[PDB]
Structures are given as structure tokens and as C-alpha cells.
Ligand binder design. Sequence first.
Ligand SMILES: CCNc1ccc(C)nn1
Ligand SMILES: CCNc1ccc(C)nn1
Lengths: 266, 267
Amino acid sequence: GSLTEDGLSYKEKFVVRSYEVGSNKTATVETIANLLQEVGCNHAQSVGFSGFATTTTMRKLHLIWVTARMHIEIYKYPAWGDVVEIETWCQSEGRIGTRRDWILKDSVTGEVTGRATSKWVMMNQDTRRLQKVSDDVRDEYLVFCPQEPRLAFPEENNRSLKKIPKLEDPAQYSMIGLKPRRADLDMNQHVNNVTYIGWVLESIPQEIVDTHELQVITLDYRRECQQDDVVDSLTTTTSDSQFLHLLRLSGDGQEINRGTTLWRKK
Amino acid sequence: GSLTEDGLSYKEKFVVRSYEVGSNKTATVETIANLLQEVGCNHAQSVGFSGFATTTTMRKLHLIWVTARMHIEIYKYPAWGDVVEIETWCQSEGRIGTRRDWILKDSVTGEVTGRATSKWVMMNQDTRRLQKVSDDVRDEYLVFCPQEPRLAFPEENNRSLKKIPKLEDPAQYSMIGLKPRRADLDMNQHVNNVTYIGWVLESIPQEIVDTHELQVITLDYRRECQQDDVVDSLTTTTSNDSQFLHLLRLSGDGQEINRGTTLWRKK
Ligand SMILES: CCNc1ccc(C)nn1
Ligand SMILES: CCNc1ccc(C)nn1
């Protein structure tokens, strides 16, 4: 793994492991979202950030970078034993926060097999208070970003920026009583962003998973699920097959996530 | 990853990933059990077997290798970003089945940071009926094994071969209503052997996990948990060091699926 010649992006190769693949012997979408997370952490580490991408100002201010949205689009899931090359870079989005992008490539053919974009915001780690990002914070990471815009999804009016609606009760399909275990936590004891993807997908009928492959997934993150919390995953078909998703806490019905998935017939 | 000079063992290096570590920034025991599984799968692939290590006779006969026991003992959990080198080899145990062993090593110092041994049995995949290993099946994989004994736990009185008792109700601690999700299944849609390790450990109090580190884990596998099954994880302390007794059973009928023990030392 290394930063590119200009130092404004990072690349890494991954050999697909036996436990990382699904019933069709290709990496699951959760293995992909994990690999994006891993190359993201390695790009931050290689540029000085020893908290993910927490600058010197943020560590003292008790501020952290938090995912607001993740959008992944896959064309070909890499096979077990294959090598996948991922390129990642960060970009400032003014006071809103940062945008981290990815390009997934086949290491033998060089063809793009997928792409991802994520939108991150800054919050206080002691309270969920969303912040508008200071000008002094910006200048600390802006030196590690390209200045000319470089977007993984440059298409004006594409899937990555579309507003997601709330799932109306009753749902078509559901997977109730989901609790995270220790393997679902990160090194800071918080639930891993990838687990929520798995939970959304748990309500999809097995018949869709068996006859279709996941093409697009957009996940809006609203609130975090704590260790002792229980979750309900809801799904309704809105149509290729398209779905509407809602993650909420089993008890009060408090929203934690919302999203959509797009699937193609195998 | 490659077979050694003699072709009777396999080695592979792994860089510890950010999502693979625990609160102490070192690989979890579940990341370790997964890495053992991965190097096991790669040693079988590099020698012809590509079902895990299914011979051409096991394939026609609908026979598979299933884990009966796993024993892992760790001295140092590798840090996030560190490189761990694992060496694996398989050995025949007559008609009982095979034994697959591992040596975990630090890639910078060469020191052994852990070791593991697993005992595998032959089973008919359709009827779930166990059976002794035939001569014809044996001759197919014996060529890939060392003939002189090579044991990861060679000791005369070792923890890897001790009989585990059943946990008597009521348990001291428990973690009720555990269901596997799709990320818990392998490529054949069966529950992954590593998930059961996570389920045993879910009943351990957080105060043990925070003040102690896992040293030894022995897991006996008796029955598999199906996709739609729900599991109960039970724990009772049996003891400077903390020792526990574990029992995994199906929430419904109380059917046993796993039993084991864990050994923890104060950080
Ligand atoms: C290049 C390292 N800097 C950053 C800042 C924020 C985010 C989300 N990612 N990366
Ligand atoms: C070299 C491949 N041979 C085998 C056979 C059985 C087992 C459990 N592992 N490995």
C-alpha cells in the first residue's frame, strides 16, 4: 500500500480470502465496505493521522469524523483468490464536511469493477452535536486533498446524491431482534459502519440473494446503535429489483438508518 | 503464501487490518481463528484439493471433513499494522481422522506468538453420519503429510487433549437469543466455525475482557447451528488467572451444539 506519485491519493492490493466470499465464490458487499474502510485508514495513517483522520485541533477539541452517507456501486464482485486494487482520496466540501471517494479495479485487466463515495460530518465525541467545521481545522487536512474536483460519481444528478424517503409501516419483509456482538465493534468499542449494511441486507428475501446480485447500495446514517441496543431491519419492494430500507431500534422505534438497494438478475 | 522447501507444510504472511483489532489495538481471537482457516484453505489449494480438502473419493461419496475440536493458545496478539507469519500442516491420525496444526510467529523477531491444533473427522454431508477413514481416501492425502510426528502441542500432559465436562444449570453468566446473519455463513451456506468462538465469548463479562487477555481456548464441536436456529451461550467461572466453562445450546429444545473452556491472565 502506498500514496500515489503526487501524494494526493492512496492505493492498496487485497487478495480475496475464503471467508470473505458468498455462495457464488465472490466477495460479499460487506467484505468490500470493510476493504474501503481499511484503505481509508491506511491513507490517513500514511499522511500523519495516528481516531480516524482526527487532526491535531480535533483531538484537543474532542471532535470526530462520523459517516453521514455511504454509496457503493459494484459491476463485478472479485472472485476468491483474485487481487483487487482500490484507490482512495479525500476532498473538502466547505463547511458541510469531507467527501471520501474510491475506485475499485481488477488487478489483472485494470478495468474498474466498482466505485464508492461517502459523505462525512464532524461531531463532538461527548455529545452528538453536529458542527459546521472551523477554518483552522480545514487548513490542516486540505494539504492532503486534490484542489481540482475529482469525483467517483461525477454525473450531475446521479444516484449518490438522491434524497431517500422513510419506509411506511407495514413493511413487506422484516428481520427483527438483531443484536451486535463484540466482532461487530471497532477498536473504540462503537458499532462498525459495515454492520449496518449487513443488517439492512438481512431483511432481503433469500430468493433475491440467490437469483440476483447487489448492484447499488446507498445508506444514510442518522444515529448510532449502542452495544446493548436491539435492531429491526425493514424492507419493501419499490419496483431489476429495487428496495426501500429502514433500520430502527426494536423498542421505541427510533430511526438509525435508511436506504435503497438495486439488484440485477444473475 | 507458499509451501515450504519439502512441500509438507505451508506459510503465509498477514498484515493486521484496522477492523480486525479489539479495544487494545491487537487482533481479536476471532481474527486469529479466521487467519488459521484462510492459511488452511490455501495449503489445501496449493496441493490439489479445490469442499475443504475433499479428495476425489470424498467427492463422489459425498464425504466432508468437519471440525470436531479446535485448541488455540496465544502468547502475544499481533498489533494493528504488524505482520504475522503462520505455518500450517496436516497429519493422519489413523481411522479417527486428520489433525491440522499451526504455529503463529512474529515476522520481525521470528518469535512464536501462539499455536493451534484442530482435530477433524470424516462425515457424510447428506445424512450427517460420522465414519472412520478408509484406506483409499487416506492414501490420497497421506502424501501431503509429514510421516515423522510433528505436533504443535507435543507435551506429555497438555491442555489440547483434556476431556471437557457439560455446564450444569444454572450458569453464572449467559447471552441469550443469538442468531447468525449472512456474514456468519461460509460459501456453502453453513455457519462458519469462527462464529461459534464469538458466541462462546459473548457470555464472558465485559469486566473480564477489559482487565484480562484470552490465553487458551478449547472448543469441542458436536452439532452445527442452522441459518434459522437461535443460540444460548452459557458461562460459569471454575477458578492470578481466570478459568471458565462454556456451553452453546439451541434456545428452543436446549440441544447441545458446543462445549469448551477458556483461560485468561491479568493484563
Ligand atoms: C486524507 C486524510 N484526511 C481525511 C479527512 C477526513 C476524512 C473523512 N478522510 N480523510
Ligand atoms: C493437504 C490437505 N489435506 C487435508 C486433509 C484433511 C484436513 C483437515 N486438512 N488437510
